[PDB]
Symmetry: D3
Subunit: 148 residues, 6 copies
């Protein structure tokens, strides 16, 4: 039972894919916990990409996301993190199978539409980093017991 | 040039229609300004429904929405308010034409999926009431000039 | 609280529209009670079109449906009958609005894809005529109380 | 039995709507006669829009369309012209109902995505003008006898 | 040339997925032979799942399916069985790729939405068992010679 | 940076799939350069299948396509050729994964709906063979820099 951080990146937003991406997660049956449209701050972006702290691309990459806008979500369910990765596809859209977001919509990795958490450790950081705890929604799905 | 407040209500959320509704607004070409998933407070709900202040249904209605969850949006464009009404349909889904959200998904008015602002005055209140000003996103669509 | 009889006609079946039509009624929120794919008997068709018993086109119309195949459904809900008409469109496709089954898929009256009960009296007859009591399914939807 | 001229205008092409529009005509059941993607010539554009020869907005209207690109189509069927109009919606998208092309995707009237032949007279002119005799395709649909 | 048994399980029906699934089989081009919505009998269920006669999870598995409802189908085509498997995905949805039924809509394996015949042996058993000879529909597609 | 030739074959045209296919390539992000609907000449078909010049099935395959109709497209982008193969699926539909054109719509090799250039060498030949230089459209997408 997990929560994963999913983020429509600026290219996703410019291309009008927010609704499509949300809907794919919703139909999959993960439970929505948090969502918001935003212009991120540089500090949040720099923490988000902390693992790439001192490499040549770091500045350009941070600039691209902090310029925004982005659409932020947290989704909940058994093996949510792996499911997010499955729905999104591989890092390179050219290697992504049709059916996945990247497979269906992306061309080059610089513009791969959407972020999904990579691991339990990344998910734990990302969920707390992008959303304050008052933004987490407690609710119960009448239909939930037929999903898991 | 207007902004309208659009809200997926609890029945919308339970039925898995957040993504579908967002996507219909996105494809229409209105520009997204603000969005968030939330559990509303009674005080916000009571202000939202202020025009029904002292009628028999007021308590039940406020309870239904404040129990939540809801999905909140603001959308921008020429005649956004009228466009929101067009996409959503008439108050009673049974009177709503197929193609509209209510036409395509709703059965009875108590469960009509989604709220759209009714008028310029309602929109002005609703946008400021549901969203703090730091939640409004400034951005520019590369494709915008082909929409309006 | 009503039950309406809905029938994908042979032109609809030939064109691969059974699923699309079932889906529209399902997405609308009506509760499915009954469904089967069949080659109808001439007796049932002749009863179905009994109001036209003594008219010129009667033979051709009966043969058309009895030759089949058809897909039969019963759908339940408040004002299901009116809702059926709303989803299907006007008798002639050139007059049906986009969004409806005929408006989206039909070209001429004789190939108008699908049948919906026209009134309470017709539905009462059609539901019992096309389906036996054994073929009516009693069940309870967990999400049902969010629809009506 | 008519032929109507349908043209995806530059805004339609910029917004990635060619397939969406083609698909809607195709699902409606009209028979495709001709199609091509092109940069139109100024001569053709001024001739197409000749009814507007002496008018303030003529030079801008022509420039917009001849700058291109456009996707040109011919569609065949009983009452094809009226049907084109039904699928597309009214001149102004704000006044176009959901389910039509303009109702689902348009906002303003300068950017209303697609053209449809207005009348029998207009259709005959437009077909002869945007297409050459040898671009018209003769073929027969196996399923066609189930459409009209 | 094969016939495969496809069954929308109770979770599928609860989640409003009957039309979605039918539509995917229909678009794939397999030919529909039989369909019905039913509350299955305990006798049929225990027989269908006989390979699991003596096992801890037998009594719960049968109860789940016989409580119902289910939507039953037969689909015909060259290598229909393997195709059913391809459309549906692997037993566990987490391991099912996007684009399949389970990959797009499933989360856990107890709630994996739909059954598909596993092998030729299984298909012949399942068809004879969930359907009676007179529920099988003989018909011919005009477009069928363009599919196989 | 590549151009790939994509062709809806007669079975695809007969089944109403032109729009669906155009839409998938458009949604993927490749830039449309060329498109037309046509009855192809035997000369062009024979060249198209020249690698099979001296084989038994050659006559039947040539007749099948030359009888037509076909819908021809050229699509541009980084690795367009590989992307074309990815969207279309494996040569045989029973082996193509759900999500692909063949995986979603095809049943057998001979009716596999659509053609995509197989390699750089094939694409270079196919683009010039099926289209004249005059039919290539030069244009610039406002949203283009968000795709690649």
């Amino acid at each position: 039972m997990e929560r994963t951080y999913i983020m429509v990146k600026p290219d996703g937003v410019q291309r009008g894919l927010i609704g499509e991406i949300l809907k794919r997660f919703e139909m999959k049956g993960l439970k929505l916990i948090a969502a918001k449209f935003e212009h991120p701050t540089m500090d949040v972006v720099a923490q988000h990409y902390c693992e790439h702290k001192d490499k040549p691309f770091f500045k350009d990459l941070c600039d691209f996301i902090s310029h925004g806008p982005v659409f932020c979500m947290i989704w909940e369910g058994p093996e949510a993190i792996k499911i997010g990765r499955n729905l999104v596809g591989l890092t390179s859209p050219v290697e992504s199978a049709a059916g996945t977001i990247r497979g269906d919509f992306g061309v080059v990795k610089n513009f791969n539409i959407v972020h999904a958490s990579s691991s339990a450790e990344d998910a734990a950081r990302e969920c707390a980093l992008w959303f304050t705890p008052e933004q987490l929604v407690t609710w119960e799905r009448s239909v939930g017991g037929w999903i898991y």
